[PDB]
């Protein structure tokens, strides 16, 4: 079996069905769907999951026959049709769905039958031309010809699809979103921890329904922007917003504010707030700097959702009010109350202060960052199209010459791996409610919140101190104990391939020493998602002197962000040698293209 589809899908079902709290989020007819799936032949299931994992559409039978899923497809198709899982071309009625089935040559023919301008144009141009032209009923003739070219086609029924899609959603809350069917899930070993729920995330079936819907909406818009369709991301935002202004006053949402942050992010209101945030990003690309502000004030006006997205909101409110423009009178109105917001991280506090400095009151405060050592290195920029490496790979070579034979470009991951190795027991400890809810988590659900540290404070305080005052020998021992206990395998916070060997991990740890590791581990436990991002590109070290350097690499016209300046300062404060390594694009005279 060179797909993993059914295998992973079956593991997903097992994981979700285990929790009887979750299964009450489906009615009997819906759980009936799940029973029916199990009753299907192995082959019917292999086909269903394959269709289920890909983006939804009709599939030609010829395409299913060609990719050789069974010897005779007819009985499989019938089993699936009888069970309510699949529908056939008799139900295929929407012109746009039919056109989508067609190949480039097929569309080209249709175009000649119907005398379109450019029968040799792009598939999507031709499709749009057909749709536009489709208004004895001409659109009907087009539909009939097009259906005829398409041939027998199938499509998974939207009803059972939604059951499985919600099951898939329950399986991994937010931690291209169903790629889980693509990896070998069944082969993965998860950490040993105890499931322990106390608090429901979803009130009832409806709550999960609404959350699933909001989730799909956000994902459509997120992808639209990434492809560059800025016009076509604006209208669903407004569709969302219309719905949001009704939803925010819904009774089902009153319980969501009694959830700790680490569960609250798995609720509708959180999803809409993320929509509204994406919405603001849209207007900024569309030069509509007026309406963005109106939405930023509304986001900032509330403290229920996305508190970690406050600094970015104030920072954009200011930048918009500044160079977008009127009036320069209420920008500092926003900068001052921004600087008063305790949810705003140091990086955004700087960008706000850095703008208040631009001047003609202005009472407080005092923002200043320690400078770190800068270095310039030389390299040969390759043509955008026309031996042989990337910017960091280059820098590594410079440090190799400079004396640091060992080096790793892992960014934050190298440290979050050490962290996972040194704090495994605490990260996975029992007695914290709501934090492990199923058997397939790689971390506790509160890793990235203030709640992680507070719920484990005594163990962390003892452990962080144990590390700080530890001799090198102990550190090597701890890394080994975890490594061996988790067989270099269990799926977690630890990137088992980040290091060449347990031996290399042990060397790094003997160079960093207790104090530095403890400081970084303390940071990772206090604010994981933000510490990790701010950790520099490389760690390099000399194997004999045990000296090491943390190094950020900046290519030509690459700039140290505010966030990075702060974290380099924090690392330096812990006693680590820290350096910015600039690369200057230089000429060569000995190898062209
Ligand atoms: Pt994309």
Author numbering: 371 to 505, 517 to 556, 570 to 754, 766 to 791, 810 to 1016
Show me the paper's own sentences about this structure:
In 2010, four groups identified a novel FA-associated nuclease, FAN1, that directly binds to monoubiquitinated FANCD2, participating in ICL repair. FAN1 is a structure-specific nuclease and possesses preferential endonuclease activity toward 5′ flap structures and a weaker 5′-3′ exonuclease activity in vitro and has been hypothesized to cleave DNA in multiple steps. The FAN1 nuclease is recruited to the damage foci through its UBZ domain and acts as an effector by executing one or more DNA strand incisions during ICL repair. Previous studies have indicated that the depletion of FAN1 or mutations that defect the nuclease activity cause hypersensitivity to ICL-inducing agents and defects in HR, suggesting its significance for efficient ICL repair.
Here, we report the crystal structure of human FAN1 lacking the highly flexible UBZ domain (referred to hereafter as hFAN1 for brevity). The crystal structure of hFAN1 was determined at 2.8 Å resolution using the single-wavelength anomalous diffraction (SAD) method. The asymmetric unit contains one molecule encompassing residues 371–1010 with four disordered loops (residues 506–516, 557–569, 755–765 and 792–809). The overall structure of hFAN1 consists of an SAP-containing N-terminal domain (NTD, residues 371–594), a middle tetratricopeptide repeat domain (TPR domain, residues 595–772) and a C-terminal viral replication and repair nuclease domain (VRR_nuc domain, residues 773–1010) and folds into the shape of a short handled scoop. In addition, the nearly identical orientation of these residues suggests that they may share a common DNA cleavage mechanism. In addition, the notably disordered loop between α11 and α12 is close to the equivalent position of the “wedge” that protrudes into the substrate junction in the PaFAN1 structure, suggesting that this loop in hFAN1 may be involved in DNA-induced conformational changes. In contrast, at the equivalent position in hFAN1, the hole is much smaller and unlikely to allow ssDNA passage.
